[PDB]
Every structure is written in C-alpha cells, then in structure tokens.
C-alpha cells in the first residue's frame, strides 16, 4: 500500500489541472449632476409693455 | 577576592560589531537547522504514510 499511496499522490498531481481567470471590481457609480443649459435653441423676441 | 569576573570584552564599537556578526551567523546557521529538521520530518512523514497505506 505504500505503492498505492504514492500512486495516489502522483495521480493527484498528474491528473489535477485547472485554470482560473478572475477579475472583479466593485462598480459603484455615483453621479451628482444636473441637466443645465448652455445653449441657444432658438431666440424668441419678446417685449414687455 | 570574593569574585573575579571579566566584564565587557570590547572595544565599544566592537561590542556591537561582534554581537551583530555573531547574530547574523547564528540566524543563518539556525535556519539551516530548520532546513535539516524539516527535511527529516518530511522523510519521516513519507515513511509513516507508506506504512499507513501499507
């Protein structure tokens, strides 16, 4: 059985192969903004009386 | 004379240098010791495992 034990260990090393690719990140997007205006859509001309 | 003892074998620069040198040597030597011991332990473990499987 020493042979069996050795065989087990050798088989473990030989047989076992795995590959792992891991990439993770905590995506926490926090945005504070406002839809302000900086444009001239169309100029309407008005007057006050 | 009640007692006679050598105290501070030096010089002073020598105190530190000497102790330091011995210290480093000791650390490495002992680590070598760990290596030997560990090798023996692994050999032992191998024997026992084989016996156990047996």
Swiss-Prot record, chain A:
Spell out the subcellular localization from the entry: Mitochondrion inner membrane; Cytoplasm; Nucleus; Cell membrane
Tissues with expression? Expressed in myoblasts.
Which chain regions cross the lipid bilayer? none
Q: What induces it?
A: Expression increases approximately 3-fold upon entry into G1 phase compared to other phases of the cell cycle. Also induced following inhibition of mitochondrial protein synthesis by thiamphenicol.
Q: Which residues carry the post-translational modification N6-acetyllysine, per the record? A: 12
Please quote what the entry notes about the protein's domains: LC3-interaction region (LIR) is required for interaction with MAP1LC3B/LC3-II and for Parkin-mediated mitophagy.
Query: Family, per the entry?
Result: Belongs to the prohibitin family.
What function does this protein fulfil? Protein with pleiotropic attributes mediated in a cell-compartment- and tissue-specific manner, which include the plasma membrane-associated cell signaling functions, mitochondrial chaperone, and transcriptional co-regulator of transcription factors and sex steroid hormones in the nucleus. In the mitochondria, together with PHB, forms large ring complexes (prohibitin complexes) in the inner mitochondrial membrane (IMM) and functions as a chaperone protein that stabilizes mitochondrial respiratory enzymes and maintains mitochondrial integrity in the IMM, which is required for mitochondrial morphogenesis, neuronal survival, and normal lifespan. The prohibitin complex, with DNAJC19, regulates cardiolipin remodeling and the protein turnover of OMA1 in a cardiolipin-binding manner. Also regulates cytochrome-c oxidase assembly (COX) and mitochondrial respiration.
Recorded protein name is Prohibitin-2
Origin species, per record, is Homo sapiens (Human)
Q: Which residues of the complete protein appear here?
A: 251 to 299 of 299
From Swiss-Prot, chain B:
Stated induction or repression of this protein's expression: Expression increases approximately 3-fold upon entry into G1 phase compared with other phases of the cell cycle. Also induced following inhibition of mitochondrial protein synthesis by thiamphenicol.
Which tissues carry this protein? Answer: Widely expressed in different tissues.
User: What top-level branch of life does the organism fall under?
Assistant: Eukaryota
Q: Which residues form a coiled coil?
A: 13-47
- Give the UniProt subcellular location, in the record's own words: Mitochondrion inner membrane; Nucleus; Cytoplasm; Cell membrane
**What does the subunit comment say?**
The mitochondrial prohibitin complex consists of two subunits (PHB1 and PHB2), assembled into a membrane-associated ring-shaped supercomplex of approximately 1 mDa. Interacts with STOML2. Interacts with MAP1LC3B (membrane-bound form LC3-II); the interaction requires PHB2 and takes place upon Parkin-mediated mitochondrial damage. Interacts with STAT3 (unphosphorylated or phosphorylated at 'Ser-727'). Interacts with CLPB. Interacts with CD86 (via cytoplasmic domain); the interactions increases after priming with CD40. (Microbial infection) Interacts with SARS coronavirus/SARS-CoV nsp2 protein.
Write down what this protein is called: Prohibitin 1
Q: Which organism encodes this protein?
A: Homo sapiens (Human)
Q: In the record, what lineage is assigned to the organism producing the protein?
A: Eukaryota, Metazoa, Chordata, Craniata, Vertebrata
């Amino acid at each position: 059985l020493r042979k069996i034990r050795a065989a087990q260990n050798i088989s473990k090393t030989i047989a076992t192969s795995q590959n792992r690719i891991y990439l993770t990140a905590d995506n926490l997007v926090l945005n504070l903004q406002d839809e302000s205006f900086t444009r001239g859509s169309d100029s309407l001309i008005k007057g006050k009386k | 004379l009640d007692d006679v003892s050598l105290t501070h074998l030096t010089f002073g620069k020598e105190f530190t240098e000497a102790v330091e040198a011995k210290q480093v040597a000791q650390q490495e030597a002992e680590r070598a010791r760990f290596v030997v011991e560990k090798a023996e332990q692994q050999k032992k473990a191998a024997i026992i495992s084989a016996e156990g499987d047996s």
